[PDB]
């Protein structure tokens, strides 16, 4: 009975360890632009200042 | 004053009076002190390093000099 | 809803007499409470550190900054609650701690200034907001005008604020002189490889930091924090800390900084030893305010430190806040009062506080234990999680000088308790009046937070894991 | 009641569940006490040899005496850690 | 002007309790002896004798034991030997 | 049902208010005042408390009881430090001896028992 | 368990009134009705905070 | 529902005893005494057959902040025992009312403060032995320190400011360096646990420096040589129960910590580094015990006596042998018996009678208190390490284990039997013999309660001295559990 209880406790702690180590990898994971900056306006392409604009500026 | 460590304990004190130590066992017993058990009158300025001049200090034999008696023992 | 408060209330103060000054602040107290309560749910605006850029690449609202955005309202409720409520109903406490007419206006102006740093993406919004809060602290120092130390400290704060104004502006100017942006998408770990933007972002950091008490620029904030009245310092030693430090921790513009690390060492060292031979309590308290920002400089160095920062912020903005209010209570029991603006100075004066009550002493004792990291307190796990971030990325000598700083700090924090529990020879047996109930109830709340704050240690870690990532 | 739980090695027990690990620790423990009881029993017999023999114990139970002195370095508590923390043939 | 409120009515503190009769006639010489002793470090200085003591017991004595312990680390194995066996491991 | 007296306890402080201080009460190195006071000291011994009764009541009764028992404790022990007082019989056991000889020591002996037999 | 969390949060509030009296130099039980108010409000936070934590956990469960 | 209502009733009972009685000094004893019966019934249903940790529970889990939790995910604070963890609790609970007894007729100033503090620090060090995680073992390793600091500063003898400072200073110094290694293993493993770690190894150079943290933590707390700065001058101004609980509990708590924290995952570094231990260990035996001989304060001699046993204890700890571990435990429980009775000799009985702890006043004590002089002498004889008291039973096993791990360090370690005796008899004969001193009026003899504490503690030594096997039915796992001789 006591070994079954400790099986539950030690597996709970290993669930805790493999929770947190994964969450640390979830921290340092490369974030997409949609999460990092504004969700809409998915491009970072500025295309700003459009009054005296010249055809051919995009590349 | 008396021994080597006694003179090597002098520059520590700042406000102690620096009395001359003397073994109370080697005071005569027929003077009548306060503490007849320790040959000690009450308000006596105790020595810096009292417990080597207490009655409870070790005996300190008085007939032979220490350095002299060492020679006699090694001669035996 | 700050501006929605301000634009109404300055019309309201202008249309008001002088005896309403308590009641306006009681209104703003209840107002900020209901702003927090009725609108708390905006933490739901993200689930996976989902960050918004609002007003067009200008502000930045995220998972992180929403916390500080809540925190400043939480502390302002306490600061306002000092004003609006009497301490006692005495003659003394109405010629002391009576607010001016314009004061509560300047606070919400400052909170606008503080929030528009932490939410700022742009350098231009940064510059506007640091000018805004600098002008705020200029006035809020200078508002209690009929005190010579007050005006002298206002001028003293003014010129260093002007140097850091021009220095931050010169850093922004130089960054613009090499790059055609002002935002911080332009860093993205690629220009850092191939361009010496070290020294420029370092000079940005130093100019932002030297409004804190960072140890090259050391004595002058301390001279302020004693020359201020005892009331204003409990506000102005807090807001310029947590505003710009939340900015600097939000964007880790100096990673493996050679400069910031050496200044962090020197900060911890001279703050800890500067707390030593001092009998003026505002000094001692300000050097505590220095060394804790010393720990902040350590948290500036790391990468992805949103736990240890925010947890130590909500540590510090409770404990550092509360120890003032304890010695605000303590001036009733003392035997000598000078200086209407600044009643207690000498730490000797609270010599016999335990024979006045045990419980203000116990409440003082646990918060002064909270600055030194005593393990059953909330003040402990701050230092614990700092060190869980320090050796995460190998600041080894920083960790051992943290230990030296913690010991030399905890020497002088106990000096308060060395004073506080002794003999007094003239003990209280019966006071007529009591302390105003809910004003003291706030301190009871703030201290059960510190003692019983390890209860929600687990739940805050879960909220950290779900929301902030 | 004199129960007898089983012996479990430390080889091939997948050091992730606490059940098999703790069973192996207790098995290598209790078996070491079994190994110790040989030393205790042969000591109990060797003194009886000395009791009966009188003078001729030198030649009566020389093999029993050097049996005791040979068992002495190899019959003691030695820790489950040493076999657990390491692996031979590696 | 600024004095604390009149509604204090503060009283003098007592120690609380009973005057035990003094069962001791203290000796001023013995008291100043012991008070000279317990705050010895507040008047301690460096001399040649201080330097001799801290030469021996702070540096020389641990270096003697370090010459003992590391050089004689796991040499002796006094478990059970025989007439002719080596006593050390080296 | 150890229910204590109310009105007697009201009247006890009326006697107490007239009494001289314990720092005076036995400084006279006879029974013009001693005979009353060393029987007042029996009111510290008299044992009216109320086991269940203390639960069911108010703070004024508790404070009045506390001041009574404080002064009764005083006059019980002061004349014991002089001289009921003029007696010499060791039959009063002590305060702590209830829950130590009847809890602590037998539980310790039980602990000894269980440590022997579990071996 | 939700109820066991509520009991602890209301105990925190009970301690708030208990401490506040002792700075006010009042007795332990001075204004008993206040123990109700503090008994709710802090418990109310335990209402909210646990409702946060419920809403936290399910989000993780929806990422598998 | 029921377990909640128990506390809901008991706090109301507490308030009404506060109301009617002035002192809760009766009910403090009433609670601390029932703590025995609680822990003893826990000892009854103890399974001796399991290295497995028996009475396990979690506090401060996510799914239950206030109380018990049964989850598959747990970041809370684990609690559980075995053996090793158990006996020291059993060292605690038969000690803690006694010191709570120890100040009964003493205080006469803020009693409801003082006894609450004395009980509270003991309730902290109860759950120190229940703990199972490095965080959880740490977080009440210094919850002592607040209510230790207050208990030293108020109720100090004289110049207690310096005493209260040092019991903060050096303890906090070693406290932080404990926490350093705690943080390192809590980010390498990401499991603070006293269960999982036997499965884990470290690289040798890493395992070096984390030992270098933990070892000079315990060097502070069990005072080895750059420490026992504070040990004289924290006892010498402490009040009675605080000095008793320090020398009975805190030292053995760190002795427990080096068994629990260090040894089972420091297996590969400490075999390199036990001679570094043994230099300092023999040194802090010999140097401290020689420093006993010239001490003028009375309590300070018993303080350095409390050093001189722990110096023997930790070499048996790091002996990497069987007899050393068992000897270390029996040294711990025997010294935790014999030492607070000696603080009853200096601070308990005598300091209440004369308020001065200088040796030179006190001689000829036999002629007016013979039935004190008996309890003087045989308790001193127990401090030497005569047999039939457990002190020699610990000394012999631990000196033997230290003789195993390195024989020459044990051969010079053995002279500690002499060096413990020199000051003890130099104190005892001066207290005993001669005419009763002229400074000295005849005071009251040993009271009933002060006979009574001594009667408990001396018999508690003598039970282990006649049979050390009275507690063997717990430790025999942990005698094995910390050996790495492969």
TrEMBL record, chain B:
The keyword Transmembrane helix applies. GO terms for cellular component: mitochondrion. It comes from the Eukaryota. The keyword Membrane applies. Keywords: Membrane, Transmembrane, Transmembrane helix. This is Uncharacterized protein. It comes from Yarrowia lipolytica.
From TrEMBL, chain C:
It is found in: Membrane. The lineage of its organism: Eukaryota, Fungi, Dikarya, Ascomycota, Saccharomycotina. Keywords: Membrane, Mitochondrion, Oxidoreductase, Transmembrane, Transmembrane helix. One of its GO terms (cellular component) is membrane. This is NADH-ubiquinone oxidoreductase chain 2. Its EC number is 7.1.1.2. It catalyses: a ubiquinone + NADH + 5 H(+)(in) = a ubiquinol + NAD(+) + 4 H(+)(out). GO terms for molecular function: NADH dehydrogenase (ubiquinone) activity; oxidoreductase activity.
TrEMBL record, chain E:
The chain crosses the membrane at residues 53-70. One of its GO terms (molecular function) is oxidoreductase activity. Keywords: Membrane, Oxidoreductase, Transmembrane, Transmembrane helix. Residues 1-19 are annotated as: Disordered. It comes from the Eukaryota. Its EC number is 1.6.99.3. This is NUVM protein. It comes from Yarrowia lipolytica (Candida lipolytica).
UniProtKB/TrEMBL annotation, chain H:
One of its GO terms (cellular component) is mitochondrial membrane. One of its GO terms (molecular function) is NADH dehydrogenase activity. It is found in: Membrane; Mitochondrion membrane. GO terms for biological process: ATP synthesis coupled electron transport; electron transport coupled proton transport. The keyword Zinc-finger does not apply. Residues 131-410 form the NADH:quinone oxidoreductase/Mrp antiporter transmembrane domain. The chain crosses the membrane at residues 27-46, 77-101, 113-131, 137-155, 167-189, 209-233, 240-259, 271-293, 323-351, 372-392, 404-423, 452-472. Keywords: Electron transport, Membrane, Mitochondrion, NAD, Oxidoreductase, Respiratory chain, Transmembrane, Transmembrane helix, Transport, Ubiquinone. The modification N-formylmethionine is found at residue 1. It catalyses: a ubiquinone + NADH + 5 H(+)(in) = a ubiquinol + NAD(+) + 4 H(+)(out). Its EC number is 7.1.1.2. It is a multi-pass membrane protein. InterPro entries: NADH_Q_OxRdtase_chainM/4, NADH_UbQ_OxRdtase, ND/Mrp_TM. Belongs to the complex I subunit 4 family. Core subunit of the mitochondrial membrane respiratory chain NADH dehydrogenase (Complex I) that is believed to belong to the minimal assembly required for catalysis. Complex I functions in the transfer of electrons from NADH to the respiratory chain. The immediate electron acceptor for the enzyme is believed to be ubiquinone. Core subunit of the mitochondrial membrane respiratory chain NADH dehydrogenase (Complex I) which catalyzes electron transfer from NADH through the respiratory chain, using ubiquinone as an electron acceptor. Essential for the catalytic activity and assembly of complex I. The gene is nad4.
